[PDB]
């Protein structure tokens, strides 16, 4: 889709540079994209790839890296707290919130799988939404919750040619 072409554009931008170092905005955009796709190894390697002088010159790189450390340790509740600490540039204003949504979905998976019963406070910390998302669990999704115990209960959700190829390979 368009995401593939956008990634191709970033690959082109990274491929050639005046001296192997690109502009700080595109470096921050690449680091944010690496954080978005959960490709954290390339994210940290890009972070150490940045020269120390330009790294210390701008604090936006520091904030992006702090978000990267927060997501590296899988500290879900603190990801939203850290992502809101700083203000991002305008050209990446709407997409970074989208990244938050992505993390949202990630947390949802980590609750739907690997949790038969989850404490309401821990569930709210993982998803980030304080109390209202719990409602979305029962009314919309279809779970069954109960009060006075705060125990959320997640619920776990062309060939003939191939065979001819196999026989042709095996017979010869």
């Amino acid at each position: 889709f368009s995401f593939k072409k956008l990634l191709d554009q970033c690959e082109n931008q990274e491929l050639e540079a005046p001296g192997g170092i690109a502009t700080p905005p595109v470096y921050g955009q690449l680091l944010a994209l690496y954080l978005l796709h959960n490709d954290m190894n390339n994210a940290r390697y890009l972070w150490k790839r940045i020269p120390p002088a330009i790294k210390s010159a701008n604090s936006e790189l520091g904030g992006i890296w702090s978000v990267g450390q927060r997501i590296w340790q899988r500290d879900f509740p603190g990801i939203y707290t850290t992502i809101n600490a700083h203000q991002w540039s305008e050209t990446v204003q709407p997409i970074m919130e989208a990244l938050r949504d992505a993390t949202r979905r990630r947390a949802f998976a980590l609750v739907s799988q690997a949790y038969t019963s989850i404490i309401a406070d821990d569930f709210a910390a993982f998803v980030g939404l304080p109390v209202e998302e719990a409602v979305k669990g029962i009314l919309e999704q279809g779970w069954q919750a109960d009060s006075t115990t705060r125990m959320v209960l997640p619920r776990k959700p062309q060939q003939l040619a191939r065979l001819t190829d196999y026989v042709a390979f095996l017979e010869n």
């Binding site: 060939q159 003939l160 065979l163 001819t164 026989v167 095996l170 017979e171």
Partner: protein
């Protein structure tokens, strides 16, 4: 065509060369394959069933190619044998002497290649007298093979039940599952692998006269009828592979051929299943 039209083209130069070389005199385990024509098979079956529970027998016509005995025709000797023994006293010999000349007149260039004989109700094997006769025929007519056909077992089981055997020469010095299937002389002979072949025109008229059993094939559904046969082939192939790797330290080629044959039949069954699913299950939603 052309390539599949072979085996019916009979030449005398190659036959003379292999008959003069006599390579079987050195290697006693020479012949391992018996390629029998459809006509010979059909004539053998009908002659064997014609005698009922009395033993009947006849000759074969054919040739030799490498390590393979090719059977192209079958005889019908005028022998009046008992329920367990056939003799061929004096009329069979003159009949087979005259039949070869009569066939030479019309164009049958194949010479005698062996004898076929019926075992009405006692499997397919060589008894003591069968071993003696076959070994004599091999000692004086070196290219030879003894075929035994069971008519009653073939009719009861619904499958062709015949075998081809060649005896070891006297003095050939070199488990418990070869004593009930065969006789006490089971070590005096060996069984050639038997395969059947037909011609282009024969298969043409066979497919032409195939107009009532399409229902049988459209619901044949192998991989269930031949499941036991397939797993038998597989656990024999595992032992064959073990022998091949022991040799490694060409058996591996034969094991690979057997694995390919079993796998190809399995994929043929799967192709039949896929075709049936496309035909009957992808229609009317």
């Amino acid at each position: 065509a052309q390539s599949i039209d072979e085996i019916y083209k009979y030449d005398k130069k190659q036959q003379q060369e292999i008959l003069a070389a006599k390579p079987w005199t050195k290697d006693h385990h020479y012949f391992k394959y018996c390629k029998i024509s459809a006509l010979a098979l059909l004539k053998m079956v009908m002659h064997a069933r014609s005698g009922g529970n009395l033993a009947v027998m006849g000759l074969m016509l054919g040739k030799v190619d490498g390590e393979t005995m090719i059977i192209m025709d079958s005889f019908a000797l005028p022998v009046e044998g008992t329920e367990t023994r056939v003799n061929a006293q004096a009329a069979a010999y003159e009949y087979m002497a005259a039949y070869i000349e009569n066939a030479k007149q019309v164009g049958r260039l194949e010479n005698a290649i062996g004898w076929y004989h019926s075992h009405p109700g006692y499997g397919c094997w060589l008894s003591g007298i069968n071993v003696s006769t076959q070994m004599l025929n091999q000692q004086f007519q070196e290219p030879f093979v003894a075929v035994v056909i069971d008519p009653t077992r073939t009719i009861s089981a619904g499958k062709v039940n015949l075998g081809a055997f060649r005896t070891y020469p006297k003095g050939y010095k070199p488990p418990l599952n070869k004593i009930e299937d065969f006789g006490v002389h089971c070590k005096q002979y060996y069984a050639l692998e038997v395969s059947y072949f037909k011609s282009s025109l024969d298969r043409k008229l066979l497919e032409l006269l195939w107009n009532k059993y399409w229902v049988n094939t459209l619901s044949s559904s192998s991989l269930l009828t031949n499941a036991d046969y397939t797993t038998g082939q597989v656990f024999d192939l595992s032992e064959k592979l073990e022998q091949s790797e022991a040799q490694l330290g060409d058996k591996l080629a034969k094991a690979t051929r057997d694995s390919c044959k079993t796998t190809i039949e399995a994929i043929h069954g799967l192709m039949s299943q896929v075709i049936k699913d496309k035909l009957f299950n992808q229609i009317n939603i």
